[PDB]
Design a protein around this ligand. Structure first.
Ligand code: SF4
Ligand SMILES: [Zn+2]
Ligand SMILES: [Zn+2]
Lengths: 39, 131, 98, 752
């Protein structure tokens, strides 16, 4: 791709090196409370 | 004959740096690479089918207008105006004479452009440059 | 028909989509049905044709219908025309033979 | 009634007269008697046209000078309204004086609006109609038919029938509006356009638009017929600067140049063929050119030049042809290389603003085109096209733009600029270069009028401040004032809304056009006001693009669904016919009680003449200040020119331009003093523009309404409508806002 760009021709690819990889208190209620953590 | 040199057929896509020059002798488009390869040593016949007029590398220039006919007319106009150059005061304000002179100059330019009387017109230019 | 911009992403229905071109033709026919000479009091065509040789500065892009990168219409004018035609059709239907 | 001024008897067409109307007539008479120009601002709710016509007609028919009258409006619909008013006034005068006094009053417009030919009136553009009418009336067809009856060329029966009768017997004495004129000319197979064009020099009063007085293309022929001592009236003249500027402005596109090249090649081929077969025409034209004759001396009165004179008549050179373009072929080559130079200049990569002198110098350098030959391009092309027998001119239509641009740029150098932009539309994949030749000084086009005519009245309903107009256009006024309507009870409620019901600021700034909070606030305001508005509701948007985007957002949100339950929705569209049909539908919906809402552009076609009164206009929502597009090269150059020359600040001029259109839209709500309406200006930026509004609107704008909320404005609107729905006490307006003859006599006695 670098040579193709140097010669003025659009390169349709990129260098792979640039691809960035990417004591509970009450218990009688146990098993009853659903976790409404967010709203 | 759209975006490639008719001789070497160098397309702009493969040669984005290609630049086409023109020669007043025959106004035939040619790329700088062909000019350098064919005329570096010295003058040579134009590399075209049907054109046998010799030309020199030093005479090449960049095309201004996109129309070859208008480029030819404008260049001939420049050559003529370099010889027939007068102002209104040259005739002491005689507008009739100035208009007739301008008409004569335009007729000469037209004759040179269309090859009506090449020999006589060129001889007249040569004489008037002296006078 | 609801006057909402159609989205290419929406799948729609294959059977009903066959009538879209027929709807275009029906819209043309309804435009002809509604078109008629207008009184000179509110004749806007005469306002623009009063001087047919007017040449000035072309209006800015804010004074022209919206367009996209490719240069074609964005389609927002179509819904405006659709609602306008709906209102015109209702008003005309009021003035029936009865 | 029939009352008396110091020495002038005036017959009013109504038994009652407003104090504002009486004072307006007195001021106009004073201006006419003293000589010079004047600026008058009359409230939109008081009869202005009727007073103007009454006073001017009485003046002309009483004094021995018998000065004619020229009425200049901004639109053809206004011409129609003025003609109707004049007809009513003349009917009253004929009923009161016992006879029909010798009087002729006509309007004037283009062929497209007065053509009756069944095959030529069916065109969508006026240029084609004009070209076909020229093909039928130039005299070429008549001459060919005379020489050889077998010729297939046909004529126009309407035009031919006119030759039988004389000019003085074209129409009977009286006032002919466009509708009545079309009916009469259809019943007698006559051409109204030619009737008017041949009777202008004889009519007592002539009514036309500002283009027929400012645009040199169509103004020279009409102005050569009117008298020099006539009265001149400019009605609704607050937006005359835009007309004056667009009169001398041109735009050239890449497509235009590409078409001009083809036209030039076709012209060269035509010249070659005529040279081959019939060259005596070329020889005769050249011989006539040598002496120094021009289009005026060559063309007959029946025919017209192919290219309309783009410059004012005073700026045209009177000398013979320079000689470079004396021959057909030489001129063709000159024009071809001019087109090539334009094409090669259209390749710039960044905005370039240059003066005509710089453009001419660069032209003289690259090519060898001088200023003087360029100044004669249009005239020479007109003569050439006339002599080449070019009955079909579709190919040559392109050369008109090049001739216009050449004759303008080689003529004017001060107050003009040339802008070359690689991007006509910045939102485009591929560059589309555009070349705009713009006039920056608005006084160049109007100087000849102000010098030719002695007395000029500039009257309007929303022309304020009055001090800037003399500054912008170089003229002096004997008096300039605005009238305060003597309303007995407030009839219009102007209010400014700066924030929505949620107390969030609202504005129509383009950079924040797509903002959910602002869009939703505007939609809520629209729905709430539509719920309380009885019959009609006009919404004016700053620009068509803004209206489109905000309407689409409302459609997505479902606000339009809420509006639909209470009122029909009519939307302004680019198509003029569709917009007219929308207006008709809106009026029908307002009349039948269904209730309607009309969305339009504050600077669009509706606001330039369409008037909403009584049932048609009840509430006016000005959505944002109608500010122009700031990032415009033409507007920026005009602002810089005004700052340098007239010492007008850019912000001041921009605010004036926007407030002028806002007031223009606001003033289309009231016809009489019994009309009422609510005028809401929905933008945080109106709060400081009260001093810039017209006097009669500023007086009605209370201090408590400078910055309101949507809910509080809705409550005020409900209360105001409920109050205005009650019967008025006759005594409250018996002699304080409406005057009878006895009250007028009492006022005159007290004043004297
Ligand atoms: S002469 Fe009148 S009716 Fe005939 S084509 Fe011309 S404008 Fe139309
Ligand atoms: Zn080559
Ligand atoms: Zn060659």
């Amino acid at each position: 791709p670098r040579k193709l760009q140097d010669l003025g021709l659009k390169p349709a690819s990129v260098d792979p090196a640039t691809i960035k990889r990417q004591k509970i208190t009450n218990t009688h209620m146990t098993g009853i409370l659903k976790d409404y953590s967010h709203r | 004959n759209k975006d490639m040199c008719p001789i070497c057929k160098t397309d702009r896509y493969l040669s984005p740096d290609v630049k086409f020059l023109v020669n007043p002798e025959c106004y035939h488009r040619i790329c700088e690479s062909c000019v350098d390869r064919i005329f570096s040593l010295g003058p040579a016949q134009c590399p075209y089918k049907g054109c046998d007029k010799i030309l020199r590398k030093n005479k090449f220039k960049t095309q201004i207008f996109d129309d070859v006919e208008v480029e030819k007319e404008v260049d001939i106009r420049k050559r003529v105006f370099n010889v027939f150059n007068k102002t209104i005061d040259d005739f002491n304000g005689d507008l009739v004479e100035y208009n007739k002179y301008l008409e004569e100059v335009e007729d000469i330019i037209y004759k040179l452009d269309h090859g009506i009387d090449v020999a006589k017109t060129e001889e007249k230019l040569r004489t008037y440059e002296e006078l | 028909l609801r006057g909402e911009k159609i989205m290419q992403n929406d799948r729609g229905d294959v059977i009903i989509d066959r009538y879209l071109t027929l709807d275009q033709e029906f819209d043309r026919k309804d435009d002809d049905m509604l078109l008629h000479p207008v009184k000179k009091i509110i004749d806007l065509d005469g306002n623009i044709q009063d001087d047919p040789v007017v040449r000035g500065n072309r209006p800015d892009f804010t004074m022209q219908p919206g367009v996209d990168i490719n240069g074609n219409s964005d389609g927002t004018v179509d819904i405006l025309k659709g609602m306008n035609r709906l209102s015109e059709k209702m008003i005309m239907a009021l003035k029936n033979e009865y | 009634m029939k009352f008396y001024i110091d020495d002038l008897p005036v017959l009013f067409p109504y038994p009652k007269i407003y104090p504002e109307q009486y004072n307006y007539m007195c001021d106009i008479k004073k201006t006419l008697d003293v000589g010079g120009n004047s600026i008058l601002e009359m409230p939109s709710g008081t009869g202005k046209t009727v007073s103007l016509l009454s006073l001017t007609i009485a003046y002309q028919m009483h004094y021995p000078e018998h000065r004619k009258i020229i009425y200049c409006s901004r639109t053809m619909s206004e011409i129609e309204k003025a003609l109707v008013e004049l007809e009513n006034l003349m009917d009253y005068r004929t009923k009161e004086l016992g006879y029909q006094e010798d009087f002729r009053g006509l309007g004037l417009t283009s062929r497209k609006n007065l053509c009756l030919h069944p095959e030529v009136s069916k065109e969508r553009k006026g240029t084609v109609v004009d070209e076909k009418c020229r093909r039928m009336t130039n005299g070429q067809a008549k001459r060919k038919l005379e020489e050889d009856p077998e010729a297939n060329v046909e004529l126009c029966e309407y035009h031919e029938n006119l030759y039988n009768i004389e000019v003085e017997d074209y129409l009977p004495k009286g006032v002919f509006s466009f509708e009545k004129l079309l009916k009469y000319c259809e019943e007698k197979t006559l051409c109204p356009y030619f009737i008017v064009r041949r009777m202008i020099s004889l009519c007592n009063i002539i009514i036309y638009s500002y283009h027929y007085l400012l645009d040199p293309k169509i103004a020279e022929r009409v102005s050569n017929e009117v008298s020099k001592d006539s009265i001149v009236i400019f009605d609704e003249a607050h937006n005359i600067d835009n007309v004056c500027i667009e009169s001398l402005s041109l735009d050239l596109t890449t497509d235009a140049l590409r078409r001009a090249t083809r036209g030039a090649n076709a012209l060269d081929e035509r010249i070659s063929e005529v040279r081959k077969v019939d060259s005596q025409k070329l020889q005769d034209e050249y011989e006539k050119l040598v002496q120094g004759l021009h289009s005026a001396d060559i063309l007959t009165d029946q025919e017209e030049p192919f290219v309309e004179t783009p410059v004012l008549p005073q700026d045209l050179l009177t000398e013979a042809i320079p000689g470079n373009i004396r021959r057909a072929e030489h001129f063709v080559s000159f024009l071809k290389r001019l087109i090539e130079y334009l094409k090669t200049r259209m390749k710039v990569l960044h905005v370039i603003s240059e003066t005509p002198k710089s453009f001419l110098q660069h032209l003289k350098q690259l090519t060898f085109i001088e200023r003087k030959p360029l100044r004669f391009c249009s005239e020479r092309l007109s003569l050439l096209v006339r002599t080449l027998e070019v009955t079909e001119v579709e190919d040559f239509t392109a050369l008109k733009d090049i001739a216009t641009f050449a004759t303008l740029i080689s003529t004017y150098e001060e107050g003009f600029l040339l802008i070359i932009e690689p991007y006509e539309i910045e939102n485009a994949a591929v560059p589309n270069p555009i070349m705009r030749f713009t006039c920056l000084d608005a006084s160049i086009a109007i100087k000849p009028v102000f010098e030719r005519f002695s007395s000029v009245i500039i009257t309007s309903g929303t022309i304020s401040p009055l001090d800037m107009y003399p500054r912008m256009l170089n003229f002096k006024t004997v008096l300039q004032k605005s009238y305060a309507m003597t309303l007995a009870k407030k009839s219009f409620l102007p209010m400014i809304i700066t924030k929505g019901s949620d107390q969030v600021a609202i504005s129509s700034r383009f950079e924040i056009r797509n903002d959910p909070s602002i869009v939703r606030n505007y939609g809520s305001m629209l729905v709430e006001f539509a719920k309380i508005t009885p019959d009609g509701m006009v919404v004016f948007f700053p620009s068509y693009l803004y209206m489109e985007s905000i309407v689409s957002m409302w459609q997505t949100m479902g606000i339009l669904d809420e509006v639909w339950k209470h009122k029909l929705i009519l939307v302004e569209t680019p198509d003029a016919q569709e917009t007219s049909l929308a207006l008709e539908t809106y009026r029908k919906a307002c009349s039948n009680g269904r209730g309607a809402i009309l969305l339009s552009v504050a600077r669009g076609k509706v606001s330039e003449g369409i008037d909403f009164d009584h049932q048609y206009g009840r509430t006016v929502l000005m959505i944002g200040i109608p500010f122009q597009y700031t990032e415009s090269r033409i507007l920026k150059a005009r602002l810089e020119f005004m700052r340098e020359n007239y010492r007008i600040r850019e912000n001041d001029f921009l605010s004036f331009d926007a407030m002028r259109h806002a007031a223009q839209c606001l003033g289309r709500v009231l016809r009489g003093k019994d009309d009422y309406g609510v005028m809401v200006l929905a933008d945080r930026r109106f709060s400081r523009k009260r001093s810039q509004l017209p006097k009669w609107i500023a007086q009605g704008l209370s201090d408590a309404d400078l910055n309101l909320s949507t809910d509080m404005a809705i409550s005020n609107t409900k209360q105001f409508l409920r109050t205005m729905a009650q019967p008025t006490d006759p005594k409250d307006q018996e002699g304080v806002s409406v005057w009878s003859y006895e009250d007028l006599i009492k006022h005159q006695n007290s004043r004297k």
